[PDB]
Amino acid sequence: HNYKSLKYYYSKPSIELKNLDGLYRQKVTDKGVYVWKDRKDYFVGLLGKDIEKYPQGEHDKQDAFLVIEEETVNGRQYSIGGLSKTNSKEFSKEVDVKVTRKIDSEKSKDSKFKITKEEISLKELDFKLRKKLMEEEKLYGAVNNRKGKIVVKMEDDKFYTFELTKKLQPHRMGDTIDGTKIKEINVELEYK
Amino acid sequence: HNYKSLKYYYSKPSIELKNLDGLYRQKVTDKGVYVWKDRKDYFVGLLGKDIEKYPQGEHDKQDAFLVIEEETVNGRQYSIGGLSKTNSKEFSKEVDVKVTRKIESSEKSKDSKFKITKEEISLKELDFKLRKKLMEEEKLYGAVNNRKGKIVVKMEDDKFYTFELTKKLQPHRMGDTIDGTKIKEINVELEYK
Ligand SMILES: [Cl-]
């Protein structure tokens, strides 16, 4: 069912690897990179426009946000996208999280969310915000708790949306945005 | 570099499995299905909307268009998308292929035929078979500059599907399918001499 796949995907643990010891694109014909830190290696899938940023060879000063998928790829644990430029300097910013709840009228309450990367993947935003919602707003706690959306709003009013009724598309996991320009996060939940 | 990867990728052999002996989705949490025919197994990734067509369990009356990627997945040869419902009966259709050359003005065109064997066909197959025709008949990826242009699959209702030749077909599109009986014409534009 749609519920089980959401619940058991977003309940998975995540690994934040800041400053990889390395990430390596072996072949121009493959769809991923070998990444490693502290003697732990993984294979990361490049299934969107992110493949264009990592040509054959090595690339340094990079971060990785991992969610270990069910597939074993090239003998390693696998994750899709979540790659980004490592911070140039220390950066930490708390943004407001407006959680509105349509029932039919509505109920809302504010919370905060800690941003720590200058350049951040949609994968990370998506996964961490859903986890926050699973823990605090009963997201995917019952078959009926799956409708709504997460909106990440920028200072120039551009925004990014995550539909809660389905998993973030793999081709969007490698997309990144300027963490320093995230203005606010608006969440709408359409369940009791 | 990009040119090299296009040549390499579209030079790969394809594998057409009509009426799979099996297609099994192991977990609702995974991103693919095990497929097999005539004692040969493979794992096919579901990285687009195609994932919604194969819930946990087994499925039959399916076809698979394979292109083996560099990645080994679950200890098997891996391909992305290319799944479709098998033909309900014998089906064939000859469709025109118009090839022009823009060098911004498209010159004289050469017309050829392309046979459609399936009722429901994946964008992966159309894309891969059509580029292989071009590599063989129009020097596609035969040199550094033979990579610009586009393949356009037009339907009866004027709606169309486009493949940019300067890059590989996006993985999230490989599993999308269209009605093979509704395919009207194939218009190709090559931006090189
Ligand atoms: Cl493997």
TrEMBL record, chain B:
Source taxon at top rank:
Bacteria
Which GO CC annotations does the UniProt entry carry? extracellular region
Keyword Signal in record: yes
Q: Where is the Staphylococcal/Streptococcal toxin beta-grasp domain?
A: 97-190
Q: Which UniProt keywords apply?
A: Signal
Residue ranges of every copy of the Staphylococcal superantigen-like OB-fold domain listed in the record: 4-87
The record's similarity note reads: Belongs to the staphylococcal/streptococcal toxin family.
The protein here is known as Superantigen-like protein SSL6
Q: Which organism is it from?
A: Staphylococcus aureus (strain NCTC 8325 / PS 47)
Lineage of origin: Bacteria, Bacillati, Bacillota, Bacilli, Bacillales
State which stretch of the full-length protein is shown. 38 to 231 of 231
